[PDB]
Design a protein around this ligand. Structure first.
Ligand code: SF4
Ligand code: SF4
Lengths: 392, 393
């Protein structure tokens, strides 16, 4: 499914086609309030945000930054911070080399015939960059040209659809321009701010076709209503179902921006792109199966997994994604369970009393001990501790 | 951007490619209670729902149906009713003929089913065939699983259950047609639980049948999860131009009517430009072909007058929610950039004669930059509105 891309590390978090789709969010505090900004960053992480943006405007924004990181290091909380910038960000960065290092990525407006400086600064520091096209950063003569071009077409498009062309052109040109300065494909993420599902889908299918950059998906905004939730899912789902998009933000202006993370997290889970808890699946059963045993087994396993969880979670990162399969026949069980981390298949009609256990390959046959259940949880467990060990 | 299908009338409401997507809702009153159910179909309709499903299962409810329709008619509200039936289906219809005739669509899941296609072909009525889990032939599923195992790359057990469900939906379709029921009166569904599944199943059904498609997720309780999942599931399909009726199913707080799910279905349809809460005025962004900012304030005043006329247009002119009005920043490109507007005006940009064309599909007039412009255009809009919408055009 997934669009291949280079990997762009934002701090410790890999962003790109080979990696899990990340959730991003932003502060809502003025950054300058180190007290209220850091609180909000700690909890957005706990909420599910793996990366966190903050707007950085007057000088008062800057001094605050490196301290904010200086306490997160101590607060255990190892989050990557992203700096939201508008023109004058350079002189800001150039003045305080201390905060350029605290930031883990810069977010900048396009520029095409200050953009130069932002790119230059990032290449010195080794910092990745998101280039986010937007209405405000759009070449007026570009717009006019596109407008003229549109009116020559056999079937000219609407005003609004030309705007979207200009937005895409604006993002692609800035992308080529960052690369032209020497930035690096492993240092470059794109996006374009849109307000409607159709627009988002259309703009990002163009960005996919014309660039190899990882893509950060998001809608401009809406209030905390149903509208806002529905719009974001409506808009993100079609892209994520095609394999386009590497980072996602949900934006619903409301104390904090905390409900946004929930929603983003949900959109990912509805489409099976991230899990919060390990999962046991078992086949439906069909004609090959004699016995309810496989199904009682799966309920038991599932039950005993749901209680190892708060241990497993704190001991073993990534374990939320564990898939366990319990199948109803040996002849078809394994083939219907290829994608399980570990699965077992139970004898069916006219089958030997043996139960194969798979961990991608065959791991072992379980002879019909009464203990099959307990033997299997032991295997799930020894599988878990190996495959989900923290691996320095 | 839409799938071609035959047209299925459910009472007043047309359903298929050529028509706007309609939303089915559902009552949770004892159907037997004429006062409670009647009022609920009314609130469900008024929250914006064109089709209402009532539950008929006892003979006590059967004799309430014709009386439910009669009471809605006396309220002037002509919303079509749909019956779902427990097993007593065919029996209750042949026993209560006027209950049968008060319904407009029959729900069936794949004597039995045949004795229900029979009484629908005899009756002139449309049915929805809704495939589902407890309708899969246990033997087919076993067979499909065998086919799957023999594949160079077998799919997951769940992936096979979805094949069984499509096949089971396609078959019951093929069936009804053979039996003697028109493409005229056949709507198709196959409810599943998860977004990806829904997309895969209805792409299958879209490609393999020719039927109008009723898109819905299985029942889930109210929450972020449920709102999101139904948005995540319906959107990718409705973007692709698939589905002709939609239904969001969320479990309401105790004792309450199923109105919020109607609200979400409308928000889903709205978020994709498949439905409009209220008329809207659109204006170009301005480029380089104009330095005049007058088109914007005209658009602002045009939008500010329409918002003043809607409360009356609502109660007076049906359909007009969907009115699109264009106000453009230049004359040489204005008309082209405003083709999907019901009614459009284009102000002179740089170099242009002090003249502004109004369009309504075609060239209508050229309103001479008399200070009147705002009023003259605004007049032409009303001329249009009374002409297009209201009692049949
Ligand atoms: S694993 Fe075996 S028993 Fe289970 S659904 Fe598949 S073929 Fe049937
Ligand atoms: S209609 Fe005219 S002024 Fe308006 S955006 Fe298009 S070319 Fe530019």
């Amino acid at each position: 499914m997934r669009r291949p891309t280079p990997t762009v590390y934002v701090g410790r978090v890999p962003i790109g086609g080979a990696h899990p789709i990340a959730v991003q969010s932003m502060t809502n505090t003025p950054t300058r309030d180190v007290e209220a900004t850091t609180a909000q960053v700690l909890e957005l992480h706990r909420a599910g945000s793996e990366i966190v943006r903050l707007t950085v405007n007057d000088e008062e924004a800057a001094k605050a930054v490196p301290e904010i990181k200086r306490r997160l290091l101590a607060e255990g909380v190892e989050v990557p911070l992203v700096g939201d910038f508008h023109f004058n960000g350079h002189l800001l960065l150039r003045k305080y080399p201390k905060m350029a290092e605290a930031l883990d990525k810069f977010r900048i407006n396009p520029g095409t015939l200050h953009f130069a400086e932002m790119i230059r600064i990032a290449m010195d520091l080794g910092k990745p960059v998101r280039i986010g096209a937007n209405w405000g950063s759009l070449d007026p003569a570009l717009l006019t040209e596109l407008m003229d071009r549109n009116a020559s077409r056999p079937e000219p498009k609407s005003a609004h659809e030309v705007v979207l062309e200009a937005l895409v052109e604006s993002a692609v040109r800035a992308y080529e321009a960052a690369l032209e300065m020497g930035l690096g494909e492993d240092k470059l993420v794109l996006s374009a701010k849109v307000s409607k599902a159709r627009d988002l889908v259309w703009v990002y299918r163009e960005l996919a076709r014309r660039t190899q950059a990882p893509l950060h998906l998001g809608l401009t905004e809406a209030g905390m209503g149903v509208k806002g939730i529905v719009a974001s899912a409506a808009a993100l789902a079609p892209l994520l179902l095609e394999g386009i998009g590497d980072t996602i933000r949900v934006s619903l202006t409301p104390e904090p921006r905390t409900k946004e993370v929930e929603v983003a997290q949900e959109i990912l889970q509805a489409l099976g792109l991230r899990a919060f808890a390990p999962e046991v699946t078992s086949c439906p059963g069909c004609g090959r199966t004699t016995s309810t045993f496989f199904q009682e087994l799966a309920e038991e396993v599932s039950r005993r997994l749901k209680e190892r969880l708060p241990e497993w979670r704190a001991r073993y990162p990534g374990v939320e994604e564990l898939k366990v399969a319990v199948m109803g026949c040996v002849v078809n069980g394994p083939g219907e369970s290829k994608h399980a981390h570990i699965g077992i298949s139970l004898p069916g009609a006219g089958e030997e009393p043996k139960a194969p256990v798979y961990a991608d390959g065959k791991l072992l046959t379980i002879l019909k001990g009464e203990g099959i259940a307990e033997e299997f949880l032991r295997l799930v467990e020894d599988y878990v501790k190996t495959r989900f060990a923290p691996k320095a």
